[PDB]
Amino acid sequence: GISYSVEADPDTTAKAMLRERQMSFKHSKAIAREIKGKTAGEAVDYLEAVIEGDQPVPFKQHNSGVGHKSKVDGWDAGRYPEKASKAFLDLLENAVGNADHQGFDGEAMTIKHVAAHKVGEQQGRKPRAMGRASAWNSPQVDVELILEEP
Amino acid sequence: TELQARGLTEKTPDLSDEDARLLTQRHRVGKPQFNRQDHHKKKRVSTSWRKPRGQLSKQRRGIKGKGDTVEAGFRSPTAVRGKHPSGFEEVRVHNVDDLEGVDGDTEAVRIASKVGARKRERIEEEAEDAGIRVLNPTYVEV
Amino acid sequence: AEFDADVIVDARDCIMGRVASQVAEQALDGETVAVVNAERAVITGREEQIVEKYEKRVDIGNDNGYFYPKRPDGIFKRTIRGMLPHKKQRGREAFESVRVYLGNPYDEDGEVLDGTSLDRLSNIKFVTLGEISETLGANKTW
RNA sequence: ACCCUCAGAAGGGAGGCGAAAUAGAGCAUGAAAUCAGUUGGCGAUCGAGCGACAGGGCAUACAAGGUCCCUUGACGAAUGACCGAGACGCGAGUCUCCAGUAAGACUCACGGGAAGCCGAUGUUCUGUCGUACGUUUUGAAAAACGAGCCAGGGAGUGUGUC
RNA sequence: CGCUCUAAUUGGAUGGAAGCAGGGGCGAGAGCUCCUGUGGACCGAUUAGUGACGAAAAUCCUGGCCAUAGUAGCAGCGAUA
Ligand SMILES: [Cl-]
Ligand SMILES: [Cl-]
Ligand SMILES: [Cl-]
Ligand SMILES: [Cl-]
Ligand SMILES: [Cl-]
Ligand SMILES: [Cl-]
Ligand SMILES: [Cl-]
Ligand SMILES: [Mg+2]
Ligand SMILES: [Mg+2]
Ligand SMILES: [Mg+2]
Ligand SMILES: [Mg+2]
Ligand SMILES: [Mg+2]
Ligand SMILES: [Mg+2]
Ligand SMILES: [Mg+2]
Ligand SMILES: [Mg+2]
Ligand SMILES: [Mg+2]
Ligand SMILES: [Mg+2]
Ligand code: NA
Ligand code: NA
Ligand code: NA
Ligand code: NA
Ligand code: NA
Ligand code: NA
Ligand code: NA
Ligand code: NA
Ligand code: NA
Ligand SMILES: [Sr+2]
Ligand SMILES: [Sr+2]
Ligand SMILES: [Sr+2]
Ligand SMILES: [Sr+2]
Ligand SMILES: [Sr+2]
Ligand SMILES: [Sr+2]
Ligand SMILES: [Sr+2]
Ligand SMILES: [Sr+2]
Ligand SMILES: [Sr+2]
């Protein structure tokens, strides 16, 4: 697995991690990118609105074939990755939790750092025609989060 | 308070008018990189020099812009070849007994990396006392 | 709109290519040139063949495009571009600092460059750029 | 271990052990391809063997390199004048003298200056040259053949006789 | 020039070896060497030997990895649930 790629002062910070999560890595990059800079509470309200389908996540790198969404500002293609968003909500539940236990105002804290890393693949195999089989793998993702005091 | 180097760091050698001219020439003329043809085009092809062997090779054929091929005409002057940019001839030292016979007016010393801090301390003081500069000195807190 | 020209050239009764060659040389030397009265600029030869060449340039083209100007405004501007390396940085700066005009938008009368004037009393076989444009199908607005 | 979180023997956070947990379980070291985040340089008007050599911009903790710029002055190869005086030419221009003079690369000396400053490194811009590599072939950028990328592996050896 | 192991002669290392990463210096060059970080136990030099000794290529071998792509498929069958 990963370790925190950025330094964090324990006195003014809260940490959180997700390990070997079987969800789309491509969706995770997009979510991380969008929630960075936002307040922990803003991020929760945002991701819940994505799950509901009222807010699209901008797909800037992994956008091939993706249809344009009007609510996406400054860009064109976006989607509503609910599985990966639900996993990010668990990351923000853990962070705000760890934050409150330390005496901080968890919800009001800024997302200083959030990044997803492809930690591996859970391998699978799918039988194809002509007596041959090809890969049918699941991405295993890790994601780090550093909540900072405003 | 601050960091300072052990030994005679500022020491310069006494070179003849000719050896000083040739050193300044080597420094001015320089030489090309002499890296392998198309090393930059493929990650598996290292920078290390190999003679372009291909019958059609643009570098082998001497096509302008494809890089200089290694020839003897690129050699540095005999009188100065191998000298440190300071002008000193290097002597690789491993212990205190290796500092013997060294002329600190013309030769400087370079302690092997493998040598530990304890033995380095003894070499560095015995080098300063013998009037020899150490090219890789220890930086102590003064 | 205002264009701070260093040199204002009068194209009236002057051989287009000769003016263009000099206006190019000056633009690369850092001058801000402005060609004036290009409707009255001249190009020597048999009218019937001159028009054929220019009409062919208008008929040439495909999906990629071959935009050829019909107005004397643009024809002179394209002639100047052919004497400049407009694709390079230095050449584009030179071209963009040159502007051709219909008539004279300034107060100052332009200067007639050396070797560019054509003596109408000695020549019968020539055409005016405006005459070329009228034949090409351009709207006479001069 | 304990505590907090969680649907939770999960995972996470805090904490404990140890010289070391970036020694925490396929757990010594931990390269390249390559991925996430981020820094520097370039960037939505512009052209493609991706560079070599020159020269500019911007960028740089130390260490392992310490040079570099400008006035002036000395030296000064090949080359080599302007102006002027006289003399030719229809003319563009030329000859003689001034003069192998002034100049002339490098190097050095005095005085003054720079320490992101000189080198060097990253990137980018300009100039010049430039259609990979290896093989096949008279002729390969080739619309001839081979390779997605990287790492490691991968081809004159033994005996006998001459 | 470089690689392995042998031998003689002679050195270095827990006051930090090899390796690796980034960086400095030398050599026309094969390559040598130093600094910083990492690592945490081995490593050289000279001389004479030894050879399962040097790769960009062989539709080369094995492993790993990227783009392809969040794309094709998860509809088609007289059993449309
Ligand atoms: Cl993926
Ligand atoms: Cl030689
Ligand atoms: Cl067209
Ligand atoms: Cl051009
Ligand atoms: Cl006529
Ligand atoms: Cl010299
Ligand atoms: Cl052989
Ligand atoms: Mg689509
Ligand atoms: Mg079968
Ligand atoms: Mg390479
Ligand atoms: Mg390990
Ligand atoms: Mg043939
Ligand atoms: Mg010996
Ligand atoms: Mg090998
Ligand atoms: Mg080969
Ligand atoms: Mg497609
Ligand atoms: Mg039915
Ligand atoms: Na939009
Ligand atoms: Na919008
Ligand atoms: Na003409
Ligand atoms: Na046209
Ligand atoms: Na540069
Ligand atoms: Na072949
Ligand atoms: Na070829
Ligand atoms: Na061809
Ligand atoms: Na493949
Ligand atoms: Sr894309
Ligand atoms: Sr060392
Ligand atoms: Sr801990
Ligand atoms: Sr002279
Ligand atoms: Sr790394
Ligand atoms: Sr071999
Ligand atoms: Sr294996
Ligand atoms: Sr894949
Ligand atoms: Sr169905």
Swiss-Prot record, chain A:
Single GO molecular function: structural constituent of ribosome
GO CC list: cytosolic large ribosomal subunit
SUPFAM superfamilies: Ribosomal protein L22 (SSF54843)
Domain of life according to the entry: Archaea
GO biological process, one term: cytoplasmic translation
Pfam families according to UniProt: Ribosomal_L22 (PF00237)
UniProt keyword annotations, A-Z: Ribonucleoprotein, Ribosomal protein, RNA-binding, rRNA-binding
Chain's role: This protein binds specifically to 23S rRNA. It makes multiple contacts with different domains of the 23S rRNA in the assembled 50S subunit and ribosome.
Oligomer and partners: Part of the 50S ribosomal subunit. Contacts the macrolide antibiotic tylosin in the polypeptide exit tunnel.
NCBIfam families hit by this protein: PRK04223.1, uL22_arch_euk
Family to which this protein belongs: Belongs to the universal ribosomal protein uL22 family.
Protein name: Large ribosomal subunit protein uL22
UniProtKB/Swiss-Prot annotation, chain B:
Residue ranges, compositional bias (Basic residues): 38-64
Signal peptide extent: none
Disordered as annotated region, ranges: 1-87
GO biological process, one term: DNA repair
Residue ranges with Basic and acidic residues bias: 8-21
Superkingdom as given in the UniProt entry: Archaea
Keywords, alphabetical: Ribonucleoprotein, Ribosomal protein, RNA-binding, rRNA-binding
Cellular component GO terms held in the UniProt record: cytosolic large ribosomal subunit
GO-annotated molecular function: DNA binding; nucleotide binding; rRNA binding; structural constituent of ribosome
Residue stretches spanning the membrane: none
Function field: Binds to the 23S rRNA.
Subunit structure, interactors included: Part of the 50S ribosomal subunit. Interacts weakly with protein L15.
Family under the similarity heading: Belongs to the eukaryotic ribosomal protein eL32 family.
Protein name: Large ribosomal subunit protein eL32
Organism (species): Haloarcula marismortui (strain ATCC 43049 / DSM 3752 / JCM 8966 / VKM B-1809)
Lineage: Archaea, Methanobacteriati, Methanobacteriota, Stenosarchaea group, Halobacteria
First and last residues shown, out of full length: 96 to 237 of 241
Curated annotation (Swiss-Prot), chain C:
Keyword terms of this UniProt record: Ribonucleoprotein, Ribosomal protein, RNA-binding, rRNA-binding
A GO CC annotation given for this chain: cytosolic large ribosomal subunit
Gene3D superfamilies: Ribosomal protein L13
SUPFAM superfamilies in the record: Ribosomal protein L13
PROSITE patterns: RIBOSOMAL_L13
Pfam families registered for this protein in UniProt: Ribosomal_L13 (PF00572)
MF terms in GO: mRNA binding; rRNA binding; structural constituent of ribosome
GO terms of biological process kind: negative regulation of translation; translation
Function of the molecule: This protein is one of the early assembly proteins of the 50S ribosomal subunit. Binds to 23S rRNA.
Family: Belongs to the universal ribosomal protein uL13 family.
Assembly behavior: Part of the 50S ribosomal subunit. Interacts weakly with proteins L3 and L6.
The protein's name in its UniProt record: Large ribosomal subunit protein uL13
Species annotation: Haloarcula marismortui (strain ATCC 43049 / DSM 3752 / JCM 8966 / VKM B-1809) (Halobacterium marismortui)
